[PDB]
Amino acid sequence: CAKVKGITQGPNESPSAFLERLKEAYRRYTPY
DSSP: SSSTTTTTTTGGGHHHOOOHHHHHHHTTOOOO
């Protein structure tokens, strides 16, 4: 299905916007 991929990766950013709040915290206490 072409027109219904909204948003695919993350599923409406549902893991990604929580995992980005975790990655700015983990980069405050680990320098890459």
